[model samples]
Target: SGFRKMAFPSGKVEGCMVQVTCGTTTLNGLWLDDVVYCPRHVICTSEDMLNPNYEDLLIRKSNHNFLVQAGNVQLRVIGHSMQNCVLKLKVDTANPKTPKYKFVRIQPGQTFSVLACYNGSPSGVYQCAMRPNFTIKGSFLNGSCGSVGFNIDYDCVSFCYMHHMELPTGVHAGTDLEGNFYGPFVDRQTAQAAGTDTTITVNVLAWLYAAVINGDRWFLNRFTTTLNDFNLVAMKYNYEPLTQDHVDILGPLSAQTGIAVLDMCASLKELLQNGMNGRTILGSALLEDEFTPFDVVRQCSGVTF
Candidate 1:
């Protein structure tokens, strides 16, 4: 004789309740108990939980979790004319299984804003994917056609100096164009006392003097002695001598140093020729062990004379 068994009726549970809460607030609920039953050993059960079509359920759950846990994040670009670009922002969460989302079609001069909904997921890196085309128009004469190109960051202001010390000087005269005495010309002893790096200072001063002489701001007669000595050395050394090899090598260095030297010399010459004589505009003192303009020419010539 087998023990008598009683069959438990299916769909006997009248009502089912599912509630979700975050902190002190209670979220929405769903009921499915009417067609389901909970075993005495089981406190709760979800019959439709295993359903693969529960997309809405997963999405809602994810949204709720994101809203509760995530922090605010932002991205931006620096400098001008960076608009009209597409940027891809992503969160990796260090989860190797998920793919990244691509944000596209960003307009020019506009910032793309995205709210990173998922938090504590390792703030993923953001990168700009593409940029809009930028064109710079060339200056035209009388509405003439000009080429278009991209603008470059010249960094010109960075190259500006207080004085033209970086270029070579030609010669120095100890007098102003008006036949005035120019200096207690800096002697070697004085230059040495000033600093061990007197060579650098002398080079810079000689360059200034060349500007003055070429501009004729001062008459060389006033500093006849100094001018004669400089001329003697220059002539003896053949300072201004030119060669084919030097011409080639100097093409590039000249393009750089020549521009700076010419600018400074022209300005000095203009000031002197215009009778703008003053202490501030006076020629620099001589330096001992300073290589004159002739020295520079010879070295740059790369030839023994």
Candidate 2:
């Protein structure tokens, strides 16, 4: 598959340009209204349903594949109408990385069958459509083909927005309420350059404190990694358990006066508890469940209809 990029200058709803390269045919289309306006020759080159040399690399020999990089976007391909019947297409919608169907035998009668992406709650679901489908190759849909066609449908389950945390001005690195002095914490901009055992952990820990103090649930997404890395330093892989006081003292809020702060602290403690219980009890498989808000922004926020 060739690299394709879609860009929106004014906005997506107004119109956008999809720069696409299929095989050797490089084409640009103004995706306006509801249709894509490419040259007739370009359309013939790319959309010829019969020849199937079109790039986007959706179909190949016995391996017909769906777009795994669709993220939260759901895709549905249905047999519009049939003639002789029995249209088969293999799909991998569940278990990811593992092929779901060698052949989804679509028998025809009055109507048809569908192979669609799974639609479910977006949280805790990472890379659902964010990453590419590397392992499973879909089977050609028209095993016994004659008069059948397909309708490709796409939908956005939900839209998520991400805003990077902006560190508050005037907050200096210092001691916490419990006299646990922490600091020389760097902001995210400098966090990368300030790479060191003590520096990285403190910055993330400080960010965590600010997140909890402000009750920012978006920042909570990093809780797992924060603890995971902190341990690599604090416990040195011996996997000594994490404690609430350890969490509380690391990033002390400057004010911490409101009932909201209390509630946030309570919630943070609960998260700390839920996130306790060393490696065995707690598991470290992040890709299985970790869905960051930025992942949603990067994968789902751009184009959807």
Q: Rate the local accuracy (lDDT) of all candidates.
A: 0.22, 0.24
lDDT of 1: 0.22
TM-score of each: 0.15, 0.18
Candidate 1, 1-305: lDDT as tens digits: 11111111111110111222222422211112111101110111133323322233333332222111112322111111101110111222222221222112222111111111111221111111001111111111211110011111121111000000011122121111111212222211123111111112223333444334335234222122233343343344323222233234334433534433333323423433453444332233321222334333433443321
lDDT of 2 at 67: 17
Which ranges in model 2 have alpha carbons more than 4 Å from their true place? Answer: 1-17, 25-207, 210-275, 278-305
- Report the C-alpha displacement of residue 94, candidate 1, in angstroms: 22
- The residue pairs in collision within model 2 are 64-138, 71-129
After best superposition, candidate 2 residue 227: deviation in angstroms? 17
Worst 10 residues of 2 by lDDT: 129-138
* Count of residue pairs whose backbone atoms collide, per candidate: 10, 2
